[PDB]
Each structure stands twice: as structure tokens, then as C-alpha cells.
Amino acid sequence: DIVLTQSPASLAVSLGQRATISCKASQSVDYDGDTYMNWYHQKPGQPPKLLIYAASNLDSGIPARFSGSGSGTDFTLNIHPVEEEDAATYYCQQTNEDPWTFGGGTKLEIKRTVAAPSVFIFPPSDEQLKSGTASVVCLLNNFYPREAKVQWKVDNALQSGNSQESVTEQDSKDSTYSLSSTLTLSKADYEKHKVYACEVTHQGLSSPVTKSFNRGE
Amino acid sequence: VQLQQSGAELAKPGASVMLSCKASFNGYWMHWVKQRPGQDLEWIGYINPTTGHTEYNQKFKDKATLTADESSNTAYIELSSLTSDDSAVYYCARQEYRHSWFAYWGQGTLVTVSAASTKGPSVFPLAPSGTAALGCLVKDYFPEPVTVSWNSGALTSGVHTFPAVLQSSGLYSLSSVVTVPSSSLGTQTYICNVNHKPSNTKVDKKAEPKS
């Protein structure tokens, strides 16, 4: 089996600049003057899409910012200049010998200017509360970079081990992320406290941002 | 063209599962590709629907069986002896004669291997307060996936539907949020439309300022 090694596993490229992704094959994928190497990319929730076929041929419907090169065992995909929509995971594939094999993939992040999150907090609905559970939701909207600290303060005490985070993929149009933090408590533990707050720390915020509510009001 | 794959499946450990892919006048090969959640791509094998000839990745020789019905241009894959490692998205892809690449892919079929039973979600509003945020908490369903739209698909800008997380109960949960002009909260109705096909449940929930 021909093993394909992609490098790097991930990279961040500035808007308008060049992204270079490598694929090394454990054997030659050349045959009779032709090279059997393809590049694909995949955006979240979608099937992969062909970019380059036979090492260096652009496919119809693909912008000419994508180009491929190399032969034998060393191959390169070039994206220049990168655009917001190029956030995706990129895969090489060899079709020279059975079984066909894929590279491990390269996740491309598009850089942009620092953008502080807008923060919203949501108390549990009355109808969930009646069923015996309280979900408290903290939302961080449209921020960059992805790294963010979301702490749950309950009567000004730090909570641990009872919240779960979820983060969107990088937005293909503005290159930001969004994040939700959900604090889950039983109804009886929820009633043990008055003030529920989520405190957000992020490179784009001068000082941490706190959104809170009083249980009941 | 297009490749239409069958819907998401839930199957118990040790059972079998058959997935289908319908293409909608030439020779071509139907390949199948496995992608585990957030992971790499594995080539399973291909079949020629004209001759019925198949080739398998040796790693799937005992796991997968490829079948084609040329009468309706439908290709099938049978996965047997299912384990947790078989939970993944399975794609069908078409290779045209004279091509050494995939020209079209199906949208993929999610297979979940678990003894847990199907359960539909509960939907709770995330009630708002010049920009407001509102949303819906989609809680306690199994298996993946669930689809969320807003105003029957009319509202798409500003929508974020987060990836689901497995809760301590073993059921999935997600939230879908949208930012809207804060001045439209008293005039505009915002309804989330939740669809969970594995349990055949569709729920509409109004997200509005709490009384």
C-alpha cells in the first residue's frame, strides 16, 4: 500500500498570502509519463471536492489560485493568494496502485484581524425547569482568534466539571469563530444559587467581559 | 448528474447495515470511502456496475460487501459485524471511464453503532434580552443528526448551529443561535424548525422575549 504523508497537519495563512501543502509518497505514483496524484478539499458538512488531478491539472470550476506540482514521490499544493473561502481541510490521494490511499489531511485556517466576541447569556426556560433540569447557555459570537476562556461563576465561585463547550468551524466569509458554553445542573442544585455569570477572556478584550442574571428575575 | 445516498443509520453492535447510493449511459466505477468523525479518509473498494466486478481494500475484505443494481444505477455497501470503530460517515464516489480521480461524491451517510435506542429531542427557547441574540436548545436526542432551520429556511444570515455534544446521559444536545436587529424583536417572529429523522420528529419552537 502506497502511504501518503501530508505536511503540515495544520497551518494558518494570512489573507492574500501563499499556502503551501506537501504530500510525500512512500513509492513513485508515476506510470508511463503520467502521475496519479490528486488533491481534494473538504468544507464542514460537505463531501470532498476535487481541486487538482494528475498532480498539476486544475479542474473545471476551481479558481486558478490553486495549483499543483511535483512528480515521483514529492508533491505540493499551492494556494496563492488565499481567500476567506479557502478555510477547509485538504487531502492528497494516489490512484496509481490498489488500494487507493489518502493523505492524513491538512487543515487550513485563514488569519484575520483580532475580533473580540460579543457575549450573551441565556437563563433556563421555565418549561425545562419544570422537567427538573437547568441549562444555562453562554454565547460567544464572531471572534478571532479561536482561543477563548469561558468561566462559569455562580455566586462568584468558579464552576468546574459541569459545563461543555461547542465551537463552530471557521466562517468561510469573515474567518471568525463562534462558541457556546452550556452549564447544566439539576433543578435542586440550580436553586442553591442566586447569581449565574459567565466570564469571557479573549485576546481582543481589554478586560474580561461578564454577563450574568439573577435566578428568578 | 448527482449521487443521492440513503439516510443516517443506527445499528446495534454485531448487526449489519446496508447503505445505498443512486446515480441520477457509459461505463463508470462506484467507490466507497469511510471517514470517521473529524478523521482521515479510508478507501473501502470499488465496483463496476456493468460487470459486477469488485476490488476491496484488504483491511475491509471481511467488513464490506459491494453490490450494484444497474437497472436503477444504485450501488450498495453492506457493513457486517458492526463495532464502535464502524461508526463513521460513508461516502460513495464516481470514477468515470478514462479518469483516475473522483468526479462526483454523494453527500455521505452517517452510521452510528450503539445499543442505545432512538429518542427524539426536546426543544427549548434561548430567549433574548442594537443587536439581540436568540436561539433554541435542542436537547436529549439520539442518534445524530438533527437539522435546524429558522423561519422555514428564510432566515440564514447570522445563524450559528453548533456541533452536538454528548451529555452525561448519553444523549446529544446542541444549540442554534441567530443574531437579529434588536428593534425587530416586537415585530418579527423567530421560529426554529428542528428535524430529527431517526425518530421521525419535527418540532417548531418560537424564540421570543419571556413574559
Author numbering:
A (entry chain L): 1 to 217
B (entry chain H): 2 to 25, 29 to 133, 140 to 221
Give the published text:
The interactions between immunoglobulin E (IgE) and its two receptors, FcεRI and CD23 (FcεRII), play pivotal roles in allergic disease. IgE-Fc, the region of the antibody responsible for effector functions, comprises two identical chains, each composed of three immunoglobulin-like domains: Cε2, Cε3 and Cε4. We thus reveal the structural basis by which IgE-Fc binding to its two principal receptors can be selectively modulated, offering insights into an alternative therapeutic approach to the treatment of allergic disease.
To determine whether there were conformational changes in 8D6 upon binding to IgE-Fc, we solved the crystal structure of the 8D6 Fab at 2.4 Å resolution. The asymmetric unit comprises three molecules, thus providing three independent views of the uncomplexed Fab. With the exception of a 1-2 Å shift in the CDRH2 backbone, and some disorder in CDRH1 and CDRL1, the uncomplexed Fab molecules were essentially identical. To form this interaction, substantial shifts occur in the positions of Thr28, Phe29 and Asn30 (CDRH1), but the most dramatic change occurs in the Tyr27 (CDRH1) side chain, which flips from one face of the main chain to the other to contact Gln301 and Lys302 from the Cε2 domain. Conformational flexibility in CDRH1 appears to be facilitated by the presence of two glycine residues, at positions 26 and 31, whereas in the complex, steric constraints are imposed by the Cε3 domain residues Pro365 and Ser366.
